[PDB]
Write an enzyme that holds these catalytic residues in place. Sequence first.
Site, PDB file in Angstrom:
ATOM      1  N   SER A 143     -19.029  -1.849  -9.205  1.00  0.00           N
ATOM      2  CA  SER A 143     -18.994  -2.062 -10.659  1.00  0.00           C
ATOM      3  C   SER A 143     -20.371  -2.505 -11.138  1.00  0.00           C
ATOM      4  CB  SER A 143     -17.846  -3.020 -10.984  1.00  0.00           C
ATOM      5  OG  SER A 143     -17.547  -3.004 -12.369  1.00  0.00           O
ATOM      6  N   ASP A 162     -11.220   6.422 -13.302  1.00  0.00           N
ATOM      7  CA  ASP A 162     -11.799   5.127 -13.637  1.00  0.00           C
ATOM      8  C   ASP A 162     -11.998   5.041 -15.145  1.00  0.00           C
ATOM      9  OD1 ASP A 162     -13.374   2.832 -14.046  1.00  0.00           O
ATOM     10  OD2 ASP A 162     -14.545   3.144 -12.221  1.00  0.00           O
ATOM     11  N   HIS A 179     -10.576   2.209 -11.033  1.00  0.00           N
ATOM     12  CA  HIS A 179     -11.810   1.447 -10.862  1.00  0.00           C
ATOM     13  C   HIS A 179     -11.748   0.542  -9.637  1.00  0.00           C
ATOM     14  CE1 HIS A 179     -15.552  -0.443 -12.170  1.00  0.00           C
ATOM     15  NE2 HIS A 179     -14.986  -1.621 -11.982  1.00  0.00           N
TER      16      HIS A 179
END
Length: 259
Positions: free
Chosen positions: A129, A175, A207
């Site tokens: 991320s 995602d 995600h």
Amino acid sequence: NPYQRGPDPTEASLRAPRGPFAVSEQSVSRLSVSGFGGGTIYYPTDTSQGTFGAIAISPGFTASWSSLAWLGPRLASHGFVVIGIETNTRYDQPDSRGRQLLAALDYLTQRSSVRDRVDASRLAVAGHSMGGGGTLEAARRRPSLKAAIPIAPWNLDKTWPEVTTPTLIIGGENDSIAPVATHAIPFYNSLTNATEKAYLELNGASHFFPQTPNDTMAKFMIAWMKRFIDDDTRYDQFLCPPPRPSGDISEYRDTCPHT
């Protein structure tokens, strides 16, 4: 190849929970360290095989190292030193995450108890991320890095022509936090100066795919690290010719051949 380690790989061993090397872990306190929040070091127990390359791995926004901790022993068991980091604060932006990854590689090679084990010239970065945006920022700031692996990366900056490090971006098709259409794929196309690069899209993955053990993510992560940190041509097989879309792989892009 002096950097070569381990036996000839197999697909099953790449998907297996552990590689051939036995691993040991050393804790690192936030107070004992400068430039990052501490972390955990995973290393091969075997002194005899030789010095091993190393990778620093960063978690995402509001997350601790435990959110990715399964990667530490899994990657290290294939012949690498891993430092998984905690951040200075949980609200740290990707740019801050990149500099902290570099500081973690500095602590590991310069001050850590496992520094003798690591070859300081062969280092890599990875992250999830905003940690994934951070590994791109780290690759920007340190071109000497041998490998870069952003995982579901998030960054406001979409353009990375400065990166020369071989970079593998792993994205989730579904995602919505860091959508591949706005983040992962723009990063990939902008890497016009990466010596080699690849984009791996995981079929139907959210995600949070890296928070759980995933064999396909591990397989290509290990093969990329072997190929570029260790210069191990035996692992190019999985990277090239490029894999076609499958059950776990919705899409794959690459710059084959690897010359």
